[PDB]
Amino acid sequence: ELRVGLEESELWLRFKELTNEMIVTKNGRRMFPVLKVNVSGLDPNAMYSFLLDFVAADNHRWKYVNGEWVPGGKPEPQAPSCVYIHPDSPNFGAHWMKAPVSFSKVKLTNKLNGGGQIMLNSLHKYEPRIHIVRVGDPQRMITSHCFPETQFIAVTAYQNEEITALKIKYN
Ligand SMILES: O=C(Nc1ccccc1)Nc1cccnc1
């Protein structure tokens, strides 16, 4: 049976209990923590691609007021459909299953200035989503997995001083 497990779930949850934040910039910014998954129950002989996107969690934006994240207004129109292709793609099931699959190079941005970046709206909450695509499949079968532990608010600057400190500390 196909099983996709979050790596470092305890680390993610240290950030989630503060409400996690990720910086977006013009030129794009890497995530900490990095999203990493362990995979079992692929066909080791088959070839797959791994894709990453970010799903908008709410019909509203957030604001950090008096040390509390609270609903902050109506949402911006949805960021365009951005998908990140894992740079190991396409590859054997055996390749994906032998070691955690790491999205260490994905950059989050708030300007559509290209470079395979993920466009997010500042002060909106997003949940990472991984897709497994089988190569050469006439049915174009896809699997999609969400990672609730990894939810975060996109920000141009850290709001929560505990997040700023955690980010310097564990990284
Ligand atoms: O700090 C880490 N995990 C953790 C933190 C607190 C409690 C239990 C586990 N992992 C980690 C990952 C990547 C680089 N450095 C450290």
UniProtKB/Swiss-Prot annotation:
- Which one of the record's GO molecular function terms can you name? DNA-binding transcription factor activity
Q: Where in the cell is it found?
A: Nucleus
Q: Name one GO cellular component term.
A: nucleus
Annotated region of DNA binding = 11-171
Q: Where are the transmembrane segments?
A: none
Record annotation: effect of changing residue 131 to R: In SAVA; reduced DNA binding activity; increased cell growth; altered expression of genes involved in ossification and notochord maintenance
Tissue specificity is: Detected in testis, but not in other, normal tissues. Detected in lung tumors (at protein level).
Q: Does the keyword Manganese apply?
A: no
* Alphabetical GO biological process terms: anterior/posterior axis specification, embryo; cardiac muscle cell myoblast differentiation; cell fate specification; heart morphogenesis; mesoderm development; mesoderm formation; negative regulation of transcription by RNA polymerase II; positive regulation of transcription by RNA polymerase II
Q: Which UniProt keywords apply?
A: Activator, Developmental protein, Disease variant, DNA-binding, Nucleus, Transcription, Transcription regulation
Q: State which disorder the record connects to this protein.
A: Neural tube defects: Congenital malformations of the central nervous system and adjacent structures related to defective neural tube closure during the first trimester of pregnancy. Failure of neural tube closure can occur at any level of the embryonic axis. Common NTD forms include anencephaly, myelomeningocele and spina bifida, which result from the failure of fusion in the cranial and spinal region of the neural tube. NTDs have a multifactorial etiology encompassing both genetic and environmental components.
- Assembly description: Monomer.
The job of this chain, per UniProt, is described as: Involved in the transcriptional regulation of genes required for mesoderm formation and differentiation. Binds to a palindromic T site 5'-TTCACACCTAGGTGTGAA-3' DNA sequence and activates gene transcription when bound to such a site.
* Name used for this protein in its record: T-box transcription factor T
Which source organism does the UniProt entry give? Homo sapiens
Q: Which residues of the full protein are shown?
A: 41 to 211 of 435
